[PDB]
Amino acid sequence: GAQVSSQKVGAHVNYTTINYYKDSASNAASKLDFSQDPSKFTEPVKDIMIKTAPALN
Amino acid sequence: GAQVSSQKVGAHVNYTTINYYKDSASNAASKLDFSQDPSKFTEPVKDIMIKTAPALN
Amino acid sequence: TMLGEILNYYTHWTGSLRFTFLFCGSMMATGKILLSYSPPGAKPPTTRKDAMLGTHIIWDLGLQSSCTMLAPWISNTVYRRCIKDDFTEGGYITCFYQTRIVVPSGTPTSMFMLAFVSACPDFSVRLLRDTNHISQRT
Amino acid sequence: GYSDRVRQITLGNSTITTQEAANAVVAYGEWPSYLDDKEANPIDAPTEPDVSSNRFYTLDSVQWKSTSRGWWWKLPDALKDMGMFGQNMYYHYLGRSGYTVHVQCNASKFHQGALGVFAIPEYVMACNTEAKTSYVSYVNANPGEKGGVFDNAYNPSAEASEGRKFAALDYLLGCGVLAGNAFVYPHQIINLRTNNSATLVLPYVNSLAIDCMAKHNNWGLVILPLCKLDYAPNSSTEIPITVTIAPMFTEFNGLRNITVPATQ
Amino acid sequence: GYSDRVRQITLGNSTITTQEAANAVVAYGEWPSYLDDKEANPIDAPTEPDVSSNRFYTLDSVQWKSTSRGWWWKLPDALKDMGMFGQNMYYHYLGRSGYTVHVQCNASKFHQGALGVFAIPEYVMACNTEAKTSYVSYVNANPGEKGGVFDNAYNPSAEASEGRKFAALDYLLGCGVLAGNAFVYPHQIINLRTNNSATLVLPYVNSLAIDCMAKHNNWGLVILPLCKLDYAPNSSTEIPITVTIAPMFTEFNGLRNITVPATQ
Amino acid sequence: PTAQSTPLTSGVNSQEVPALTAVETGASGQAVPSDVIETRHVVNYKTRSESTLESFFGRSACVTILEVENFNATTDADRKKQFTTWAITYTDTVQLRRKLEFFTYSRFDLEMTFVITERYYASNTGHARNQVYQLMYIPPGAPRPTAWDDYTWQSSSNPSVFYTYGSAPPRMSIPYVGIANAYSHFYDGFARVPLKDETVDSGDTYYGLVTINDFGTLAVRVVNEYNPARITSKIRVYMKPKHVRCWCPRPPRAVPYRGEGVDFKQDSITPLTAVENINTF
Amino acid sequence: PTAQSTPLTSGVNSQEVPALTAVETGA
Ligand SMILES: CC(=O)N[C@H]1[C@H]([C@H](O)[C@H](O)CO)O[C@@](O)(C(=O)O)C[C@@H]1O
Ligand SMILES: [Ca+2]
Ligand SMILES: [Ca+2]
Ligand SMILES: [Ca+2]
Ligand SMILES: [Ca+2]
Ligand SMILES: [Ca+2]
Ligand SMILES: [Cl-]
Ligand SMILES: [Cl-]
Ligand SMILES: [Cl-]
Ligand SMILES: [Cl-]
Ligand SMILES: [Cl-]
Ligand SMILES: [Cl-]
Ligand SMILES: [Cl-]
Ligand SMILES: [Mg+2]
Ligand SMILES: [Mg+2]
């Protein structure tokens, strides 16, 4: 049950993880999650706004 | 002889076990056993009782 | 109670509670009894007309000796705490004569019922802890 | 196992049991239902409060004695201050409802007596002055959950202003017809040797799809002692009669501010 | 023909129009909805009052003047005495609701000023005594439709019993953060030269599927003058701000007798 | 996944006007440099790895300092120094708290680590054998100790850790234990509804999260009996949220805290230093 | 394996009476 994953690159490439404990709470940090959707905060508008168009028409 | 099993889920998935000792008494906790039969204590009656029917007929 | 004792080894509980009542008067005694569960946040019921606005059952005394009232799981939190706690308060269980107990002559005019509690199959507990029900001198 | 005597009724968060029933009546053979599009009238989307209001409400109990002449209630009047049903009723111009009526009266195998339990559409009753006709005040016509009682005497008032209440004369059913014929209305009998409850399921009944609940009662509920209560060890004994009623398939139209009727 | 400035909103028997809007906000990009079976908690069949309660209620108007520091309300508190919504709220232990918030403020092409309109989840505010912490009375926390006002000064009470109200200090948003950062919350601006209304559609937001409405406000509504009202012919002029709010997808559990909160 | 690369663009003369918008809508400005200048192509290989929530919170932070002692106690006050109890919270300190309070709700598992230190109280009272510590987690409802050697420390069900002085800092993981579907960092409400004409006191009741939160108690003792030399100890408690999710962002705390709530202090509500002029570079 | 889920149910008017029993049976 060894997991082999890419390392974060350094100055100049994989690493291995085995979980030793029966509870997921014991696990090391979650893997990098690059998900994002800024628009739910930066543009939470009902009607689509096209940048190149007038905001108010 | 590595055993790979599901972890108990946390806030947000497998783990590995190898037994190091020749006696099972040395082993870690038994795996979760969800078996149950409450009726041997809550309904130990000779004749079947259907809930929707009268208990005494 | 057995349920109470088990709950005091845990910090959190969830699910429905079953209250079963056994009438132990004479066979000649009749009656109707209202059993109510009122979820929290309002005036605790002290009259039948308030109690009957909550979850309730009208129990007719008869050949079937026992009646089960449920306190269904109705909670804001997913678990309640196994301590006295305003935030996870569970509400109010009450009981009133719906009609009255009636007996003929030559029959006891006072009698008893027994109340039982148990957990339903939707019930579970979490977070093992020591109980406050046992101790010793040191 | 199953029996005509043993019944459970659940509506909303409320359940009734009885172990000495006598079947149940469905008035005119028709279960209540919602109003179909092909029979609808007001066009606003209706409120259908469902479990908040369609549930058993238990009225104040009354006492049956050897001298009792009977009791009456009107519907939806009797439930006008019952929880969310009352609120929905008064916040809307229009409402319709069916009902499960459950009348409860237990005694012992040594008591005797029989109650006629009747559900009467448009239960119009006589007034108590002969100086006027149809002269009843709103307040006296709509007593709420306390209902009213019948009498075995008719004593109309000397002055018109004092007789603005019903002349609820028992043997004329308070309305100029013989009480022995009340059985043409949906009914059961609670005969103490046989049963301790009556159950009547009522559809909405009216000449309209929906109407003003605060103006108009669709049903009367009448309980008449057909055979007087008797109990040999104490002829002055009293046993309770308890009335529990659930609205069913309630539907309301014409929302606005709340109706607050006159109280005097 | 269609325009970001012209909008109609209909809920129940109520409709709003605006001809000088600026789009509309859907908080966190999520429209309100009913509670799914896979996320449910209380097991009783819920009441879903629909059109009786999910409709626009207009609060008492407030007056914007050159000296106003701002206004706040909490939700569902502001609507607790609004028609059938209020009744459903208080007859049940549990409730959830989304909202359409419509803030209205018109002036003229010669007036100027800008209001920030913010919807804040868990809008916890500071108390007004330094002898205690978190020391606010239920009555002061829950003013209802009148809401409260901000101030530009903080004067905590000499005695703890006198400071059991919010210290609604404008530039700290009444809670120890800088008001200039309130834009991280769902918001619009009513800038008088551009628009005369703000519209925010809010889903239910909480760490639970459903909660006790009488104990817990899910949203704060804050209106802050970002640029002061000015009008050259009369600097002491006042223009109304009117707040109109519709509950949406309301759902209630745990019916019993009515909650009547303390008033003093 | 990388941050945004910049495309090669020249100029425009157009009815397309990305430089203008209307923030009244509730939308932030959206325009980027290619919209308002001539840009070269720049490939952006840089990532936002270190600002993910896991990265932002991926540190053990000190949340409190506890004290315990071991000596021959002859008074009630000195007996109470032989053990300590602490209501578990992140509000004794400010740094982790402020980071968490960028958000309204969170869900995470916890890594707890402890740093335990000692010193001699005096030098004329001989020495002290190496000490073992017990740190017992007492969930709400479990009995709390009234003495360092009472029955509660047998800890049949409560989790305890026994730590030997000089060994590696002890450490354990705690699951997400909230009774709601997330932790609330802010709660705009009360624990109960006060009702019309009730006799219950309404003059000394509190507001917010403090009225509803209870994560139990940490109890700490030295397991050893007393030496002639009095030893005083500090236990620093560290928390690291892991497997983190958060919801509903908030402006960060701008002025000093003065307790467990959002209250502020009259002498400390002026965070900005005034500039000389609006035109000061 | 989980604890019991709750099914969608409405009301009844029935000779089926699950609310009554007889605990004399030992159940
Ligand atoms: C905590 C503290 O300050 N302890 C100091 C003690 C105590 O004050 C007295 O011994 C109490 O009687 O005095 C010293 O001179 C000592 O004993 O060597 C230095 C030591 O650091
Ligand atoms: Ca544009
Ligand atoms: Ca049965
Ligand atoms: Ca409905
Ligand atoms: Ca360009
Ligand atoms: Ca890139
Ligand atoms: Cl009434
Ligand atoms: Cl009046
Ligand atoms: Cl109000
Ligand atoms: Cl009061
Ligand atoms: Cl011990
Ligand atoms: Cl020792
Ligand atoms: Cl400067
Ligand atoms: Mg009443
Ligand atoms: Mg009002």
PDB file of N, CA, C and O in Angstrom, chain D residues 97-149:
ATOM      1  N   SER D  97     -60.882  22.508   4.005  1.00  0.00           N
ATOM      2  CA  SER D  97     -60.325  21.459   4.838  1.00  0.00           C
ATOM      3  C   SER D  97     -61.302  20.296   4.946  1.00  0.00           C
ATOM      4  O   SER D  97     -62.514  20.501   5.026  1.00  0.00           O
ATOM      5  N   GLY D  98     -60.760  19.083   4.936  1.00  0.00           N
ATOM      6  CA  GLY D  98     -61.455  17.915   5.468  1.00  0.00           C
ATOM      7  C   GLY D  98     -61.037  17.725   6.916  1.00  0.00           C
ATOM      8  O   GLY D  98     -60.263  18.525   7.448  1.00  0.00           O
ATOM      9  N   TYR D  99     -61.541  16.670   7.558  1.00  0.00           N
ATOM     10  CA  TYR D  99     -61.233  16.399   8.966  1.00  0.00           C
ATOM     11  C   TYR D  99     -61.257  14.913   9.295  1.00  0.00           C
ATOM     12  O   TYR D  99     -62.029  14.152   8.709  1.00  0.00           O
ATOM     13  N   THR D 100     -60.410  14.508  10.238  1.00  0.00           N
ATOM     14  CA  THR D 100     -60.657  13.292  11.001  1.00  0.00           C
ATOM     15  C   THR D 100     -61.129  13.725  12.385  1.00  0.00           C
ATOM     16  O   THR D 100     -60.405  14.413  13.114  1.00  0.00           O
ATOM     17  N   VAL D 101     -62.359  13.342  12.719  1.00  0.00           N
ATOM     18  CA  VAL D 101     -62.944  13.607  14.024  1.00  0.00           C
ATOM     19  C   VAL D 101     -62.875  12.328  14.849  1.00  0.00           C
ATOM     20  O   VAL D 101     -63.365  11.280  14.418  1.00  0.00           O
ATOM     21  N   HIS D 102     -62.257  12.412  16.025  1.00  0.00           N
ATOM     22  CA  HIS D 102     -62.153  11.275  16.929  1.00  0.00           C
ATOM     23  C   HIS D 102     -62.725  11.656  18.290  1.00  0.00           C
ATOM     24  O   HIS D 102     -62.143  12.465  19.020  1.00  0.00           O
ATOM     25  N   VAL D 103     -63.884  11.084  18.609  1.00  0.00           N
ATOM     26  CA  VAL D 103     -64.562  11.343  19.873  1.00  0.00           C
ATOM     27  C   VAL D 103     -64.263  10.193  20.825  1.00  0.00           C
ATOM     28  O   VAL D 103     -64.384   9.025  20.458  1.00  0.00           O
ATOM     29  N   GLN D 104     -63.867  10.542  22.044  1.00  0.00           N
ATOM     30  CA  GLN D 104     -63.350   9.587  23.017  1.00  0.00           C
ATOM     31  C   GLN D 104     -64.191   9.594  24.284  1.00  0.00           C
ATOM     32  O   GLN D 104     -64.415  10.648  24.886  1.00  0.00           O
ATOM     33  N   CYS D 105     -64.661   8.418  24.682  1.00  0.00           N
ATOM     34  CA  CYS D 105     -65.422   8.273  25.917  1.00  0.00           C
ATOM     35  C   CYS D 105     -65.393   6.832  26.411  1.00  0.00           C
ATOM     36  O   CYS D 105     -66.116   5.975  25.900  1.00  0.00           O
ATOM     37  N   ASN D 106     -64.546   6.577  27.403  1.00  0.00           N
ATOM     38  CA  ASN D 106     -64.458   5.268  28.038  1.00  0.00           C
ATOM     39  C   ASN D 106     -65.152   5.279  29.392  1.00  0.00           C
ATOM     40  O   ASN D 106     -65.349   6.333  30.008  1.00  0.00           O
ATOM     41  N   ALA D 107     -65.528   4.092  29.847  1.00  0.00           N
ATOM     42  CA  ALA D 107     -66.210   3.949  31.120  1.00  0.00           C
ATOM     43  C   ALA D 107     -65.818   2.607  31.750  1.00  0.00           C
ATOM     44  O   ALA D 107     -64.644   2.396  32.039  1.00  0.00           O
ATOM     45  N   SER D 108     -66.773   1.720  31.989  1.00  0.00           N
ATOM     46  CA  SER D 108     -66.467   0.374  32.463  1.00  0.00           C
ATOM     47  C   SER D 108     -67.542  -0.558  31.954  1.00  0.00           C
ATOM     48  O   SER D 108     -68.571  -0.115  31.427  1.00  0.00           O
ATOM     49  N   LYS D 109     -67.307  -1.848  32.143  1.00  0.00           N
ATOM     50  CA  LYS D 109     -68.271  -2.873  31.775  1.00  0.00           C
ATOM     51  C   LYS D 109     -69.546  -2.851  32.630  1.00  0.00           C
ATOM     52  O   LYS D 109     -70.499  -3.575  32.333  1.00  0.00           O
ATOM     53  N   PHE D 110     -69.560  -2.009  33.666  1.00  0.00           N
ATOM     54  CA  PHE D 110     -70.719  -1.828  34.542  1.00  0.00           C
ATOM     55  C   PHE D 110     -71.476  -0.511  34.316  1.00  0.00           C
ATOM     56  O   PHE D 110     -72.546  -0.318  34.886  1.00  0.00           O
ATOM     57  N   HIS D 111     -70.918   0.391  33.506  1.00  0.00           N
ATOM     58  CA  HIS D 111     -71.606   1.624  33.118  1.00  0.00           C
ATOM     59  C   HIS D 111     -72.485   1.327  31.908  1.00  0.00           C
ATOM     60  O   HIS D 111     -72.260   0.355  31.188  1.00  0.00           O
ATOM     61  N   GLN D 112     -73.470   2.185  31.669  1.00  0.00           N
ATOM     62  CA  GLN D 112     -74.250   2.121  30.440  1.00  0.00           C
ATOM     63  C   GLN D 112     -74.601   3.519  29.958  1.00  0.00           C
ATOM     64  O   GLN D 112     -74.641   4.475  30.739  1.00  0.00           O
ATOM     65  N   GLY D 113     -74.871   3.617  28.663  1.00  0.00           N
ATOM     66  CA  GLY D 113     -75.220   4.879  28.026  1.00  0.00           C
ATOM     67  C   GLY D 113     -74.830   4.838  26.567  1.00  0.00           C
ATOM     68  O   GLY D 113     -73.983   4.035  26.165  1.00  0.00           O
ATOM     69  N   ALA D 114     -75.448   5.696  25.766  1.00  0.00           N
ATOM     70  CA  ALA D 114     -75.130   5.762  24.347  1.00  0.00           C
ATOM     71  C   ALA D 114     -75.158   7.197  23.846  1.00  0.00           C
ATOM     72  O   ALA D 114     -76.121   7.928  24.091  1.00  0.00           O
ATOM     73  N   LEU D 115     -74.085   7.581  23.158  1.00  0.00           N
ATOM     74  CA  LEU D 115     -73.953   8.886  22.527  1.00  0.00           C
ATOM     75  C   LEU D 115     -74.086   8.757  21.017  1.00  0.00           C
ATOM     76  O   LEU D 115     -73.388   7.956  20.399  1.00  0.00           O
ATOM     77  N   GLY D 116     -74.966   9.558  20.425  1.00  0.00           N
ATOM     78  CA  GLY D 116     -74.994   9.731  18.983  1.00  0.00           C
ATOM     79  C   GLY D 116     -73.988  10.808  18.619  1.00  0.00           C
ATOM     80  O   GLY D 116     -74.003  11.892  19.201  1.00  0.00           O
ATOM     81  N   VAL D 117     -73.108  10.502  17.671  1.00  0.00           N
ATOM     82  CA  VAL D 117     -72.089  11.440  17.204  1.00  0.00           C
ATOM     83  C   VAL D 117     -72.349  11.726  15.729  1.00  0.00           C
ATOM     84  O   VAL D 117     -72.179  10.844  14.889  1.00  0.00           O
ATOM     85  N   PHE D 118     -72.772  12.952  15.420  1.00  0.00           N
ATOM     86  CA  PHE D 118     -73.226  13.309  14.076  1.00  0.00           C
ATOM     87  C   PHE D 118     -72.393  14.442  13.491  1.00  0.00           C
ATOM     88  O   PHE D 118     -72.083  15.417  14.180  1.00  0.00           O
ATOM     89  N   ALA D 119     -72.041  14.305  12.217  1.00  0.00           N
ATOM     90  CA  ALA D 119     -71.408  15.370  11.454  1.00  0.00           C
ATOM     91  C   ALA D 119     -72.441  15.912  10.468  1.00  0.00           C
ATOM     92  O   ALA D 119     -72.906  15.190   9.583  1.00  0.00           O
ATOM     93  N   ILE D 120     -72.794  17.182  10.639  1.00  0.00           N
ATOM     94  CA  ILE D 120     -73.918  17.796   9.941  1.00  0.00           C
ATOM     95  C   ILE D 120     -73.430  18.922   9.030  1.00  0.00           C
ATOM     96  O   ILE D 120     -72.932  19.935   9.518  1.00  0.00           O
ATOM     97  N   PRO D 121     -73.573  18.760   7.703  1.00  0.00           N
ATOM     98  CA  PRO D 121     -73.230  19.890   6.831  1.00  0.00           C
ATOM     99  C   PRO D 121     -74.201  21.057   7.014  1.00  0.00           C
ATOM    100  O   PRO D 121     -75.401  20.837   7.183  1.00  0.00           O
ATOM    101  N   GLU D 122     -73.674  22.280   6.997  1.00  0.00           N
ATOM    102  CA  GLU D 122     -74.477  23.495   7.162  1.00  0.00           C
ATOM    103  C   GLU D 122     -75.421  23.377   8.351  1.00  0.00           C
ATOM    104  O   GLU D 122     -76.646  23.410   8.194  1.00  0.00           O
ATOM    105  N   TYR D 123     -74.848  23.231   9.539  1.00  0.00           N
ATOM    106  CA  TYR D 123     -75.650  23.034  10.734  1.00  0.00           C
ATOM    107  C   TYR D 123     -76.195  24.369  11.259  1.00  0.00           C
ATOM    108  O   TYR D 123     -75.689  24.944  12.230  1.00  0.00           O
ATOM    109  N   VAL D 124     -77.251  24.835  10.600  1.00  0.00           N
ATOM    110  CA  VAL D 124     -77.901  26.092  10.938  1.00  0.00           C
ATOM    111  C   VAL D 124     -78.848  25.846  12.110  1.00  0.00           C
ATOM    112  O   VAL D 124     -79.674  24.934  12.058  1.00  0.00           O
ATOM    113  N   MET D 125     -78.733  26.659  13.159  1.00  0.00           N
ATOM    114  CA  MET D 125     -79.585  26.496  14.340  1.00  0.00           C
ATOM    115  C   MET D 125     -80.485  27.701  14.581  1.00  0.00           C
ATOM    116  O   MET D 125     -80.215  28.813  14.111  1.00  0.00           O
ATOM    117  N   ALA D 126     -81.578  27.448  15.300  1.00  0.00           N
ATOM    118  CA  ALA D 126     -82.598  28.439  15.606  1.00  0.00           C
ATOM    119  C   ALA D 126     -82.080  29.479  16.582  1.00  0.00           C
ATOM    120  O   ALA D 126     -81.234  29.169  17.421  1.00  0.00           O
ATOM    121  N   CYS D 127     -82.596  30.703  16.482  1.00  0.00           N
ATOM    122  CA  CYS D 127     -82.265  31.754  17.441  1.00  0.00           C
ATOM    123  C   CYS D 127     -83.226  31.723  18.632  1.00  0.00           C
ATOM    124  O   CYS D 127     -84.222  30.990  18.624  1.00  0.00           O
ATOM    125  N   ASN D 128     -82.924  32.518  19.657  1.00  0.00           N
ATOM    126  CA  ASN D 128     -83.650  32.447  20.921  1.00  0.00           C
ATOM    127  C   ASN D 128     -84.498  33.682  21.242  1.00  0.00           C
ATOM    128  O   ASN D 128     -84.666  34.051  22.406  1.00  0.00           O
ATOM    129  N   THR D 129     -85.035  34.312  20.203  1.00  0.00           N
ATOM    130  CA  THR D 129     -86.017  35.374  20.369  1.00  0.00           C
ATOM    131  C   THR D 129     -87.099  35.215  19.314  1.00  0.00           C
ATOM    132  O   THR D 129     -86.804  34.915  18.158  1.00  0.00           O
ATOM    133  N   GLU D 130     -88.350  35.429  19.709  1.00  0.00           N
ATOM    134  CA  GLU D 130     -89.455  35.392  18.758  1.00  0.00           C
ATOM    135  C   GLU D 130     -89.877  36.778  18.270  1.00  0.00           C
ATOM    136  O   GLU D 130     -90.828  36.906  17.508  1.00  0.00           O
ATOM    137  N   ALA D 131     -89.127  37.801  18.671  1.00  0.00           N
ATOM    138  CA  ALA D 131     -89.298  39.148  18.131  1.00  0.00           C
ATOM    139  C   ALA D 131     -88.596  39.312  16.778  1.00  0.00           C
ATOM    140  O   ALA D 131     -88.884  40.251  16.041  1.00  0.00           O
ATOM    141  N   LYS D 132     -87.667  38.405  16.466  1.00  0.00           N
ATOM    142  CA  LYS D 132     -86.912  38.438  15.213  1.00  0.00           C
ATOM    143  C   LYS D 132     -86.752  37.025  14.673  1.00  0.00           C
ATOM    144  O   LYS D 132     -87.046  36.055  15.366  1.00  0.00           O
ATOM    145  N   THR D 133     -86.273  36.919  13.439  1.00  0.00           N
ATOM    146  CA  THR D 133     -85.856  35.639  12.876  1.00  0.00           C
ATOM    147  C   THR D 133     -84.376  35.711  12.501  1.00  0.00           C
ATOM    148  O   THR D 133     -83.848  36.797  12.253  1.00  0.00           O
ATOM    149  N   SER D 134     -83.710  34.556  12.486  1.00  0.00           N
ATOM    150  CA  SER D 134     -82.312  34.449  12.057  1.00  0.00           C
ATOM    151  C   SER D 134     -81.411  35.459  12.772  1.00  0.00           C
ATOM    152  O   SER D 134     -80.525  36.065  12.168  1.00  0.00           O
ATOM    153  N   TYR D 135     -81.641  35.609  14.071  1.00  0.00           N
ATOM    154  CA  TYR D 135     -81.091  36.708  14.851  1.00  0.00           C
ATOM    155  C   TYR D 135     -80.103  36.157  15.871  1.00  0.00           C
ATOM    156  O   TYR D 135     -80.437  35.971  17.038  1.00  0.00           O
ATOM    157  N   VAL D 136     -78.893  35.873  15.404  1.00  0.00           N
ATOM    158  CA  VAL D 136     -77.841  35.288  16.230  1.00  0.00           C
ATOM    159  C   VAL D 136     -76.577  36.107  16.034  1.00  0.00           C
ATOM    160  O   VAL D 136     -76.224  36.445  14.905  1.00  0.00           O
ATOM    161  N   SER D 137     -75.898  36.432  17.128  1.00  0.00           N
ATOM    162  CA  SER D 137     -74.655  37.186  17.047  1.00  0.00           C
ATOM    163  C   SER D 137     -73.517  36.284  16.576  1.00  0.00           C
ATOM    164  O   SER D 137     -73.520  35.071  16.818  1.00  0.00           O
ATOM    165  N   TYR D 138     -72.544  36.892  15.909  1.00  0.00           N
ATOM    166  CA  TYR D 138     -71.340  36.191  15.474  1.00  0.00           C
ATOM    167  C   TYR D 138     -70.635  35.509  16.643  1.00  0.00           C
ATOM    168  O   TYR D 138     -70.223  34.353  16.537  1.00  0.00           O
ATOM    169  N   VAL D 139     -70.509  36.225  17.758  1.00  0.00           N
ATOM    170  CA  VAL D 139     -69.823  35.706  18.941  1.00  0.00           C
ATOM    171  C   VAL D 139     -70.509  34.454  19.498  1.00  0.00           C
ATOM    172  O   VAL D 139     -69.836  33.491  19.851  1.00  0.00           O
ATOM    173  N   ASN D 140     -71.837  34.459  19.564  1.00  0.00           N
ATOM    174  CA  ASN D 140     -72.577  33.294  20.068  1.00  0.00           C
ATOM    175  C   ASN D 140     -72.604  32.125  19.088  1.00  0.00           C
ATOM    176  O   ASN D 140     -72.645  30.964  19.503  1.00  0.00           O
ATOM    177  N   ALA D 141     -72.572  32.429  17.791  1.00  0.00           N
ATOM    178  CA  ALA D 141     -72.526  31.396  16.758  1.00  0.00           C
ATOM    179  C   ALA D 141     -71.162  30.708  16.696  1.00  0.00           C
ATOM    180  O   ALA D 141     -71.065  29.559  16.265  1.00  0.00           O
ATOM    181  N   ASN D 142     -70.116  31.408  17.129  1.00  0.00           N
ATOM    182  CA  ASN D 142     -68.745  30.931  16.997  1.00  0.00           C
ATOM    183  C   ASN D 142     -68.026  30.862  18.349  1.00  0.00           C
ATOM    184  O   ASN D 142     -67.121  31.649  18.617  1.00  0.00           O
ATOM    185  N   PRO D 143     -68.430  29.906  19.206  1.00  0.00           N
ATOM    186  CA  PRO D 143     -67.857  29.804  20.546  1.00  0.00           C
ATOM    187  C   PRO D 143     -66.432  29.246  20.589  1.00  0.00           C
ATOM    188  O   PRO D 143     -65.782  29.328  21.627  1.00  0.00           O
ATOM    189  N   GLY D 144     -65.956  28.670  19.489  1.00  0.00           N
ATOM    190  CA  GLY D 144     -64.625  28.085  19.454  1.00  0.00           C
ATOM    191  C   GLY D 144     -64.608  26.703  20.085  1.00  0.00           C
ATOM    192  O   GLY D 144     -65.610  25.974  20.047  1.00  0.00           O
ATOM    193  N   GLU D 145     -63.475  26.338  20.675  1.00  0.00           N
ATOM    194  CA  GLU D 145     -63.291  24.976  21.182  1.00  0.00           C
ATOM    195  C   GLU D 145     -64.222  24.610  22.341  1.00  0.00           C
ATOM    196  O   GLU D 145     -64.468  23.430  22.575  1.00  0.00           O
ATOM    197  N   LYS D 146     -64.736  25.600  23.065  1.00  0.00           N
ATOM    198  CA  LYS D 146     -65.673  25.304  24.150  1.00  0.00           C
ATOM    199  C   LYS D 146     -67.018  24.785  23.629  1.00  0.00           C
ATOM    200  O   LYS D 146     -67.737  24.109  24.356  1.00  0.00           O
ATOM    201  N   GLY D 147     -67.354  25.101  22.379  1.00  0.00           N
ATOM    202  CA  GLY D 147     -68.614  24.664  21.789  1.00  0.00           C
ATOM    203  C   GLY D 147     -69.801  25.189  22.572  1.00  0.00           C
ATOM    204  O   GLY D 147     -69.720  26.238  23.217  1.00  0.00           O
ATOM    205  N   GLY D 148     -70.903  24.452  22.517  1.00  0.00           N
ATOM    206  CA  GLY D 148     -72.098  24.779  23.280  1.00  0.00           C
ATOM    207  C   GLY D 148     -72.783  23.521  23.768  1.00  0.00           C
ATOM    208  O   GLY D 148     -72.314  22.405  23.519  1.00  0.00           O
ATOM    209  N   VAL D 149     -73.888  23.707  24.477  1.00  0.00           N
ATOM    210  CA  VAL D 149     -74.668  22.595  24.995  1.00  0.00           C
ATOM    211  C   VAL D 149     -76.103  22.696  24.512  1.00  0.00           C
ATOM    212  O   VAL D 149     -76.590  23.782  24.189  1.00  0.00           O
TER     213      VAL D 149
END
